Design a protein around this nucleic acid. Structure first.
Lengths: 155, 204, 129, 168, 106
RNA sequence: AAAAUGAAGACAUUUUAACGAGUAAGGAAACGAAAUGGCGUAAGGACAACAAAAGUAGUAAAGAUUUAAAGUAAUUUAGAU
RNA sequence: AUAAACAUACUUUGAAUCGGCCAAGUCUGGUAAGCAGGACUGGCGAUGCGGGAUGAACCGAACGUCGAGAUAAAGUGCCAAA
RNA sequence: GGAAAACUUAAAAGAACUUUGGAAAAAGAGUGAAAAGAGCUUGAAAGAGUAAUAUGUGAACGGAUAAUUUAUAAGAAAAAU
C-alpha cells in the first residue's frame, strides 16, 4: 500500500505505516483526525490522556448514538469518546516514526504530525446465528494508517 | 450614485394600507424608509368593527403547536410591518433585502425627530375617505388588543411637542430678523446692481 | 479572410435525469416515456436537439482558426492538401510516434501548412532545456 | 511559372522531396498583410466628402458646454468647424477655463443661447496640419458682467433642474 | 466635481407575470413622471457604474461600467426601456444608474 | 415542389416559393439531381507513402483518468498523465 | 358564384385500433349524482405555450433556432409588466 | 443435486544487512528496464481517506440571463504624393 502524499523534502521527514491493522476504522478515523497538525510531543501527551479518559476524541462525522460528554466544549462537536485500542495503535506508530526520524538525524523537538491518513481495509467474515434458522455476517473493520512527520519552519 | 439618506414618513393622518403599498414599491427601488408614528395610522371601520376582524386573525394558529403558528403582533409598529411585508416578494433575497430598509416607531426617536418628514398624497386620509366614514387609529386598536405601551408613547410625544414649541418660537424670531435685514440690503443703494437682476427674473 | 462563425447553442444537450443517477450517462437519448416531462416539452424542461439548431452551412465543421481539420499519418499525406493551405489544416494522428512527428512538422513548414498538434510529444526540453 | 498556391520557402538542410527546389534558387518574399489604401490628401481649403452637417444652434462665436470627455462640464467658445474631420474647433479660453485649443465631436456639446461672437479671431493656422502637428503619438512597434465667472466655473445640474425642462 | 447626469433606478427587466426578458431593462429616471417627458431621453446614454474590490496583484480596474441607450418609453408613467451591451446583472436591481446628457440634440 | 446547370467541384450543386406540434404506427439497403439522412460494436474479403521497402507502433499500441475542439444529436478528434 | 396541377383518380402491400373521457342556448331513465345511456359538432386522449392563483378538457392560440415590432384571451394599488 | 477460482518478471535476480517493535511489521538499504513486492500485467464505477477550492435558515439537482474569479486564447506588419 502506497502513501497518500509524498513529503516536500524527503531529507527532513520520517514515515511510519501499518496495514490491515485489527482496529476499528470509524474509531481510528476520528482519533487520527484529532492529532493531525499538532507537535509530536503534544500528540503523544494527548494520546496518553485519551487512554486514561482525560481528554476527549470528538466523533464529528460518525456520531450516531454517541453520547455527549463534558470535555466536548469548544470543539463545535457535542459528542466524543475515548477509544483506547485505536489510540494505542497510533501510539505505536508515532513511536516507530520517531525512531525513523532519529536515525535520519532530525530534531525530535521540531517535528509535527503533518500528514496522517486512515484507509479502509479488507474485512474478515464470521457467522452470527439468528432466529428461524438464519446466519448473518460478523465482519471486522480493519484499516491502514500512514504517518508522516515534518519539521516546522517559518514561511 | 448611492442613496444613503433616509426618507422619513410621518404616519399621522394616513391610511395603513395605502401607505404600505407606496412604501413597499419604493423599498424594492432601493430607497431607505423610516416610518415614524406608525401608531397614528388610520383604518376603515369602527372599533367594534376592527375587533371582529382582529379576533378572526387571532383564530389562525397551528393546532398541534401554537408556538409554530402565526404570530399575532399587537404593537402598531408591527401592524404596519406586517402590512408592508405582505406586499413584498416572499422567499427570495430581493424580498428580504427590501424589508431590511424599513423601520417603524411608535413616536419620533432621538435621531429621526430632527429630520425632514415627508407625506404620501395617495395615502392621505382626507383624499381617499368620505369624511363621514368612521375610522380607527392604530394606536387605539392596539390598546384594545393588548399593547401595553400606548400611554408611554403618549407621554413621550407630549414632551416632543412642547420641546418643538420653544425651538419653533425661537426660530420664528430669528427668521423675522433675518427677513427684515434682507429687505434693507435689497433697498440699499450699493446693492442696486445686484437687485435689478433679481427683479428682472422676479426673484426680488 | 475569415467569416463570422455563429453558434445557435453553445451548451450541451444532456440526457434526462443524468444528473440524479450515475447509471444514466450524459449522452443524449430521446425520452420515449408516455408521461415524460421533457418529451412533452413542459416549461423549464423543453430543451431537445432539433435540426433548427444546426449551424450555418458555410461555416460548418470549421475550427476557430478558420480552417478545416485534415488528419495526416506521414509526410506523404500532407501533399494531399499542399495545394489548399488556405482551407485545410493538418492534424497528426494520436498514434504517430515522436520521430515521425518531427518529419511531418518540418515538412509542413516547407509546404506552408498549418499544423495543430505542433506541440505534441515534445521531449523533456521544458525546464533547464 | 510557379502555381499561384506554391510559395517556396528555404529548408534548413532538412529532407526535401525531389520536386521541391533547393534553397539556392529559392528567394524569400516578405510577408504582405495590408491590402487597403490610406485616405487621399486633398487641398487644405477643400472640405472632405465625409463632412457632418452642424446643427442650426451651433454657429461661430457661440458658447458651448462640453458634457462628455475629459473637459466634461467646461464651457467653451466655438470658432469654426474642421472641414477635414467634421469636429468643432473650440477654445474654452485658456486664461479663464483652462481648456486649450482642441477638436470636439459635435454630439458632446450643448449650444447655449449665450453668444460672444468675436470676429477677427485670426484663424490662419488651426487646421488639420496644426492639430496633427501637436498630437502626441506612440513609439510604434519596431522603433459682459458675470460672464467671466460663467465660463470660469463648471456647469452642474443642481437640485430641481430636470434636463427635459432645461433650456440654455 | 460636477453633476452631469440624472439618477435612474434599475427597476427590472421587461417581463410578464411568469416570464422575463433580460435583453431590455426598465429604468425610472428621476424627474420624469409621465410618458410625454420621455422623448427628450430617447437615445441618450446610460451607464451602470459599479465598484469591484480588486486585489493588489490584479490590474483589473476597481471601477467598471456597462453602457447602453434609452430606446423607447414604457407605460404612461415615464418608465423607459434601455438596451445595454451586456445585460445588467439582476443583483443590480434597485441600484442607481447614470443618464447622461449626450448624444446631445440641443 | 419547380426551374437552371451537371463527369466530379462539394457543403448531398444553384435560385425561388411554401412549409416544420404529435402517443400507437410507418418510412430495409442501392438508385446525380439520388423512392428519408446518419453514429457506434465485433468479425471476413479488399484498399491505405505509387519512383523497387508503400497505413500506425518501444522516439511508446490497446486500455484507463481528465482538458479542449468539431457535430443539432447519436458520437468523433486532439493534448496531458 | 367561389375554390382546385406538389389538382385529381387511384392500385398493391401492410402497421396500430375498436376499455374511452369532457363541453353544451341537446335528449331519455332516475329525487339526484363528478350517475347510466344516446343525436350533431369541437376537443382531451396524442398537446406543449399566454390567461383563469392552482386544474386533461375552460378562453386565446397550436410549437424548427433566434432578433425586432404590432397583437389575442385578459389585465393596469403592492406581490406583478401595465 | 452440483459450483467458484486464468495472468509478477526476460530471468526469482522473490529484498536479507542495520535501527525501532513482544512479534507481525515499519524506515533505511539493495535487485530489477520498470516494484510490477507475491492479495504481484492494466486497474474503471459504486464506497471511503487526504490535500486544494467554494457555499449555506425545513430537501437537493437542472435551464435562460448577466456579474466576480480562474483558465483558454487573436499581431508584425506599416500612409499620401
Amino acid at each position: 500500500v502506497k502513501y497518500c502524499a509524498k513529503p516536500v523534502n524527503v531529507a527532513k521527514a520520517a514515515q511510519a505505516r501499518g496495514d490491515n491493522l485489527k482496529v476499528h476504522f470509524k474509531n481510528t478515523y476520528e482519533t487520527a483526525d484529532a492529532i493531525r497538525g499538532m507537535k509530536v510531543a503534544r500528540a503523544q501527551e494527548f494520546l496518553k490522556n485519551v487512554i486514561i479518559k482525560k481528554e476527549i476524541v470528538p466523533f464529528r462525522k460518525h456520531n450516531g448514538g454517541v453520547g455527549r460528554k463534558a470535555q466536548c466544549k469548544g470543539l463545535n462537536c457535542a459528542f466524543g469518546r475515548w477509544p483506547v485500542k485505536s489510540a494505542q495503535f497510533i501510539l505505536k506508530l508515532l513511536k516507530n516514526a520517531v525512531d525513523n526520524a532519529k536515525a535520519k538525524g532530525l530534531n525530535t523537538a521540531l517535528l509535527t504530525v503533518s500528514h496522517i491518513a486512515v484507509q479502509e481495509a479488507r474485512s474478515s467474515r464470521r457467522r452470527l446465528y439468528r432466529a428461524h434458522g438464519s446466519i448473518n455476517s460478523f465482519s471486522s473493520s480493519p484499516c491502514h494508517i500512514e504517518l508522516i512527520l515534518t519539521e516546522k519552519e517559518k514561511k | 450614485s448611492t442613496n444613503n439618506k433616509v426618507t422619513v414618513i410621518d404616519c399621522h393622518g394616513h391610511v395603513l394600507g395605502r401607505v404600505a403599498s407606496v412604501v413597499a414599491k419604493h423599498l424594492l427601488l432601493g430607497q431607505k424608509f423610516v416610518l415614524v408614528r406608525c401608531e397614528d395610522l388610520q383604518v376603515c371601520g369602527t372599533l367594534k368593527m376592527r375587533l371582529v376582524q382582529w379576533e378572526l386573525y387571532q383564530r389562525k394558529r397551528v393546532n398541534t403547536n401554537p408556538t409554530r403558528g402565526a404570530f399575532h403582533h399587537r404593537s402598531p409598529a408591527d401592524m404596519v410591518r406586517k402590512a408592508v411585508r405582505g406586499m413584498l416578494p416572499k422567499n427570495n433575497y430581493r424580498g428580504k433585502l427590501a424589508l431590511k430598509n424599513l423601520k417603524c416607531f411608535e413616536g419620533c426617536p432621538a435621531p429621526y425627530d430632527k429630520m425632514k418628514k415627508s407625506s404620501i398624497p395617495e395615502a392621505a386620509a382626507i383624499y381617499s375617505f368620505n369624511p363621514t366614514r368612521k375610522r380607527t387609529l392604530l394606536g387605539e386598536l392596539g390598546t384594545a388588543v393588548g399593547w401595553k405601551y400606548a400611554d408611554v408613547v403618549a407621554k413621550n410625544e407630549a414632551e416632543r411637542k412642547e420641546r418643538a414649541a420653544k425651538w419653533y418660537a425661537a426660530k420664528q424670531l430669528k427668521q423675522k430678523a433675518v427677513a427684515e435685514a434682507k429687505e434693507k440690503i435689497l433697498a440699499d443703494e450699493k446693492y442696486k446692481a445686484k437687485v435689478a437682476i433679481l427683479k428682472k427674473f422676479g426673484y426680488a | 479572410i475569415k467569416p463570422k462563425i455563429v453558434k445557435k447553442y453553445t451548451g450541451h444537450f444532456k440526457r434526462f435525469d443524468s444528473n440524479r443517477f450515475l447509471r444514466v450517462k450524459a449522452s443524449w437519448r430521446v425520452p420515449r416515456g408516455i408521461d415524460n416531462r421533457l418529451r412533452r416539452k413542459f416549461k423549464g424542461t423543453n430543451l431537445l436537439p432539433k435540426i433548427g439548431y444546426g449551424s450555418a452551412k458555410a461555416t460548418r465543421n470549421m475550427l476557430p482558426c478558420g480552417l478545416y481539420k485534415f488528419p495526416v499519418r506521414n509526410t506523404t499525406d500532407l501533399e494531399m492538401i499542399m495545394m489548399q493551405n488556405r482551407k485545410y489544416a493538418a492534424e497528426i494522428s494520436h498514434a504517430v510516434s515522436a520521430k515521425k512527428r518531427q518529419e511531418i512538422i518540418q515538412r509542413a513548414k516547407i509546404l506552408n501548412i498549418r499544423v495543430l498538434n505542433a506541440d505534441a510529444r515534445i521531449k523533456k526540453q521544458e525546464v533547464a532545456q | 511559372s510557379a502555381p499561384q498556391w506554391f510559395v517556396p520557402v528555404k529548408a534548413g538542410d532538412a529532407k526535401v522531396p525531389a520536386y521541391y527546389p533547393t534553397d539556392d534558387m529559392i528567394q524569400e518574399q516578405k510577408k504582405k498583410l495590408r491590402t487597403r489604401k490610406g485616405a487621399k490628401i486633398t487641398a487644405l481649403d477643400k472640405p472632405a466628402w465625409n463632412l457632418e452637417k452642424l446643427r442650426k444652434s451651433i454657429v461661430p462665436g457661440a458658447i458651448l458646454i462640453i458634457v462628455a470627455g475629459k473637459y466634461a462640464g467646461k464651457k467653451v467658445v466655438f470658432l469654426k468647424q474642421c472641414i477635414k474631420s467634421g469636429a468643432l474647433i473650440v477654445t474654452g479660453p485658456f486664461k479663464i477655463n483652462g481648456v486649450p485649443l482642441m477638436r470636439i465631436n459635435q454630439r458632446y456639446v450643448i449650444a447655449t443661447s449665450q453668444k460672444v461672437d468675436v470676429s477677427k479671431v485670426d484663424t490662419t493656422g488651426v487646421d488639420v496640419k496644426f492639430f496633427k502637428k501637436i498630437a502626441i503619438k506612440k513609439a510604434a512597434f519596431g522603433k459682459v458682467p458675470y460672464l467671466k465667472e460663467y465660463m470660469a466655473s463648471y456647469f452642474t445640474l443642481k437640485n430641481g433642474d430636470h434636463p427635459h425642462l432645461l433650456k440654455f | 466635481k460636477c453633476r452631469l447626469h440624472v439618477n435612474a433606478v434599475f427597476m427590472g427587466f421587461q417581463r410578464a407575470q411568469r416570464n422575463q426578458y433580460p435583453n431590455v431593462a426598465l429604468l425610472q429616471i428621476s424627474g420624469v413622471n409621465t410618458k410625454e417627458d420621455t422623448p427628450f431621453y430617447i437615445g441618450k446614454r446610460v451607464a451602470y457604474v459599479y465598484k469591484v474590490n480588486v486585489k493588489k496583484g490584479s490590474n483589473k480596474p476597481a471601477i467598471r461600467a456597462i453602457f447602453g441607450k434609452i430606446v423607447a418609453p414604457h407605460g404612461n408613467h415615464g418608465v423607459v426601456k434601455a438596451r445595454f451591451l451586456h445585460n445588467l446583472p439582476p443583483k443590480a436591481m434597485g441600484q442607481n444608474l447614470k443618464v447622461f446628457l449626450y448624444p446631445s440634440n440641443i
